[PDB]
Write a protein that binds this DNA or RNA. Structure first.
Ligand SMILES: [K+]
Ligand SMILES: [Mg+2]
Ligand SMILES: [Mg+2]
Ligand SMILES: [Mg+2]
Ligand SMILES: [Mg+2]
Ligand SMILES: [Mg+2]
Length: 91
RNA sequence: GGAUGGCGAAAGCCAUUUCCGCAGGCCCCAUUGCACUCCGGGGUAUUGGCGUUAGGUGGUGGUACGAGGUUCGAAUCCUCGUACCGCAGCCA
């Protein structure tokens, strides 16, 4: 089911944070406006990223487009998030 | 952190240190993991800096003391330098 936030995983853990977001914003920013991209390299967050678009139509489209797209030698696996990203909910 | 020395009852502050450790470098093991304050672990390198909230320059706000101005005089308001705390970046 739909969500303002796509969740990517199977991302190269080697890529540094700031360098990762750049590229992610570079790719997804074209499927529509992005409210933010969340990235952390914790023991449980690495490899995963939370892209937050501003309109569901963006996430959903970006989802069908990029699923499996090569990224630093690793097919991006994406799917909606499980829950409205903090900012979204409030709004 | 330790240990030793200095002023102290202490706290704290200074110092030395082929005791241990931290951030930067380089390799390594582990994790496929729905989060929104962060946060796995190890080896080697280790001059300098620092001490577990653990490196730095220049910059923004704060806190402190100092100086110049304001002022009859200021404890007010102004700007400035210095130390430190949280910020961002950048560099290690
Ligand atoms: K020493
Ligand atoms: Mg001691
Ligand atoms: Mg002593
Ligand atoms: Mg001491
Ligand atoms: Mg290191
Ligand atoms: Mg004065």
């Amino acid at each position: 089911r739909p969500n303002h936030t796509i969740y990517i995983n199977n991302l190269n853990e080697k890529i540094k944070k700031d360098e990762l977001k750049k590229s992610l914003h570079a790719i997804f920013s074209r499927f529509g406006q992005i409210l933010d991209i969340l990235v952390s390299r914790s023991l449980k967050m690495r490899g995963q990223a939370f892209v937050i678009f501003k309109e569901v139509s963006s996430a959903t489209n970006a989802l069908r487009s990029m699923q499996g797209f090569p990224f630093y030698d690793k097919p991006m696996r994406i799917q909606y998030a499980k829950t409205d990203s903090d900012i979204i909910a409030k709004m």
